[PDB]
Amino acid sequence: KDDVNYKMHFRMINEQQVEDITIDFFYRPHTITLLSFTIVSLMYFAFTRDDSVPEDNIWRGILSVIFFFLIISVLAFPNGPFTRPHPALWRMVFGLSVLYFLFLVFLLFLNFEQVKSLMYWLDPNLRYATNCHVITWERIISHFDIFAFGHFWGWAMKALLIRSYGLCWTISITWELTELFFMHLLPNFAECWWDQVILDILLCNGGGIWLGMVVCRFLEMRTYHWASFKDIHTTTGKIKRAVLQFTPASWTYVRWFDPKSSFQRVAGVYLFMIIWQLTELNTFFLKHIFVFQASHPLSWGRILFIGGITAPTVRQYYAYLTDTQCKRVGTQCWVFGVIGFLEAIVCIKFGQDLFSKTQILYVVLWLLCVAFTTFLCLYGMIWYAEHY
Amino acid sequence: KDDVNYKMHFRMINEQQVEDITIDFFYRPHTITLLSFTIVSLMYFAFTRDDSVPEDNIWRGILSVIFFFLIISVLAFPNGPFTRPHPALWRMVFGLSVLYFLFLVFLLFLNFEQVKSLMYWLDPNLRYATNCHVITWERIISHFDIFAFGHFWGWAMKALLIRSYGLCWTISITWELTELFFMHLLPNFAECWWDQVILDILLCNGGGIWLGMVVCRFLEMRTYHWASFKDIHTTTGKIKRAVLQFTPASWTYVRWFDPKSSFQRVAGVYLFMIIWQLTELNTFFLKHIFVFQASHPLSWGRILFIGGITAPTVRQYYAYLTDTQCKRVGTQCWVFGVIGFLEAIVCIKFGQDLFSKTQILYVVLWLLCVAFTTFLCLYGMIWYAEHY
């Protein structure tokens, strides 16, 4: 009867079910109405759309395949550890992750010219894509952009889900140093290195981690009592509940290191940090292989999507690593890992024009040193946890 | 607490679980080994395959996307009412059905020249694709081919799953007459109409229905006691059990008509028969729009695949139609219906060159008459069931 408990502990981190349902309209399935909508909409598009332009036909077909795969996801895909604001949103996020996985699998079979032609079809303008000792006080605040906003809030979310100053500060410092080193390696016109080791570590990353940890401690201490949207008498309370419907209903108490932790625990945390830094390398290298612009919708959309699938992945990884009755890895964690490895394989396959013969050796030495430093600081964290 | 029973009755026709597991090796998940296999295999292909030929790159990429979507299906897709020979096979069948659904959704946005070019890319030889009163006794047996074998066994499987002489004989006669009429309409060199109303109704379809009904009655009467493969002492018993692992473990008692049946019951059975005849029309019309050859692997592979997804679809449709606690349509039935309607939309969109202005009116009149005859014989069946 331990197998029943095992399957329950997997079903609670893979497809979490909603508790205390009051407005039952949001949760009753209407799959036949969805089928009628699908058929009538595809009928309207087939019989009324003008399909004389073939490129537009291919683009609309791709968009519609994506839309209806998200519908299939809402129907049949797993939900994850999250049931807020609605499980269907997380099913659609899982479907997007599966689509991206299959996109990378396809990309691994084309050659460099075919992948470049694909990227040039998605963005026709991709073909033509390309003084620090006087750092004034105001050119410093000029550094803060919308992407600095993104860094801040991404680190806030990461520190919220990880619940550790040590892990977050380790990954922050190590990745900022790695990025500076690679920018020195590539030509990059890489002057002004005081905007990566100071403004990016101490203000964006540091403040983001601080905010994430404060909000995480708040969410841990608070007590969750959710009254129905119906029973609220006033209107301010009603809109307050409708807004809180987009917040966590309960919060997990995260502890990566036990008092006396096994070798499996340490190895799992080390693997976690290695895959974290690997997903950090994937973005840098994919943006440098093909000359991607940071303002294009796919560029920041892919980063937002990775940050979105990172939230269930961290919860499922923590559950599998620590919970003893969770005998299976969540499917979102599986897809996150396979994407994070396929992107590295893509970077290695199409990334032979980045460095010379000696610069690749420099990259390998730095990656070995980074892995060793990660292990050293993880061991230091475990020692401090055991003795203090 | 009726909602718990509702969700259980849906989970038992959507994801049936295996009972009495003895050899637990076949049923324990190894998702991390699957992830390692995926990554190592894609690494081997990325780093060793010669990708200088682009058409081969596109073909291999398509095949690999299909393979790894079947892997994702084995991971996360629903199983259906069946758990034999293994639920993973039916998960992969569901994944194939989803891929075909998305293929049709994509096809609905291209124009006729693009779809013809797609079919010519899949089969380069598609571009160049094209005396009864003396019917000897032996040219009759010459009619029996591998496709007659397929008709026989398809009707056997259908009569096994439907459990009705009336429904099966109705659909048989009506579809054979419709096919003869359409062959008379199209030029078709449609002589020798004694091979469709006699040899195809009375011998292939009739014998198939008889065999299916006999095997269905046998499977209903028998008692299922499954000893483990381990406990069998001899070797003949072991191989007998290993062969019976590819047979049903239990059989449902099918009854479409109650003594006094509601209007919803009659309407659901009528809709069942209409979608059956619609899926029969889809094959004929898709094979006549583009000049498809019956021997090409995709031609008969698509028919085998439809016959494969027909088995869970009929069980889930019967469950939803008759069981009062089954408040949701199975997902395989959903995808079967959406495919059967999307194929008809494809036939209507790309099928404007088949008939003239008057022949389309003839087709519409015959389809109305066929629907009316279907309803009449269904009402006759219900009357005979009520009074005899």
Ligand SMILES: CCCCCCCC/C=C/CCCCCCCC(=O)O[C@H](COC(=O)CCCCCCCCCCCCCCC)COP(=O)([O-])OCC[N+](C)(C)C
């Ligand atoms: C030139 C280049 C040089 C470079 C050199 C580099 C060299 C560096 C090489 C480092 C190699 C180190 C690997 C050590 C492996 C041992 C791990 C171990 O045993 O822990 C086990 C589990 O471990 C796991 O959970 C693994 C499964 C996860 C796989 C999915 C991927 C998703 C990741 C998403 C990450 C998200 C991050 C995103 C954050 C933003 C511990 O568990 P257990 O107790 O043993 O038993 C199982 C658990 N139960 C049963 C008890 C419940």
Ligand SMILES: CCCCCCCC/C=C/CCCCCCCC(=O)O[C@H](COC(=O)CCCCCCCCCCCCCCC)COP(=O)([O-])OCC[N+](C)(C)C
């Ligand atoms: C020119 C051309 C002219 C042409 C003219 C043609 C005109 C002809 C037009 C005919 C139109 C007739 C339609 C009548 C609709 C009423 C149906 C009804 O109420 O029954 C209801 C259900 O009914 C359903 O189950 C429907 C859901 C199925 C949808 C998925 C499709 C998959 C099909 C796969 C088929 C596989 C076949 C493959 C076989 C090889 C009855 O149920 P309920 O009791 O009311 O309540 C629900 C059940 N619970 C809750 C009790 C449990």
Ligand SMILES: CC(F)(F)CN1C(=O)c2[nH]nc(-c3cccc4[nH]c(=O)oc34)c2[C@@H]1c1ccc(Oc2cc(C(F)(F)F)cc(C(F)(F)F)c2)cc1
């Ligand atoms: C390994 C990699 F492919 F390189 C990942 N990529 C980056 O990391 C990155 N950053 N920017 C870009 C980028 C891409 C294109 C043009 C420009 N122009 C510019 O300036 O940047 C770009 C990219 C690419 C990237 C590709 C696809 C992608 O999402 C999808 C988009 C489509 C659809 F076809 F619809 F567009 C379909 C699918 C689905 F899988 F669902 F099929 C997914 C996101 C990022």
Ligand SMILES: CC(F)(F)CN1C(=O)c2[nH]nc(-c3cccc4[nH]c(=O)oc34)c2[C@@H]1c1ccc(Oc2cc(C(F)(F)F)cc(C(F)(F)F)c2)cc1
């Ligand atoms: C509405 C329709 F499209 F017409 C249905 N079709 C028929 O009914 C029919 N009959 N024959 C043919 C046929 C097709 C091609 C060449 C020749 N040459 C000849 O003689 O026949 C043919 C067809 C087509 C058909 C197309 C695809 C198909 O399966 C898939 C194949 C592929 C992959 F690209 F790999 F080939 C990918 C996918 C997936 F969806 F997974 F992406 C599905 C099965 C049938």
Ligand SMILES: [Ca+2]
């Ligand atoms: Ca940085």
Ligand SMILES: [Ca+2]
């Ligand atoms: Ca025929």
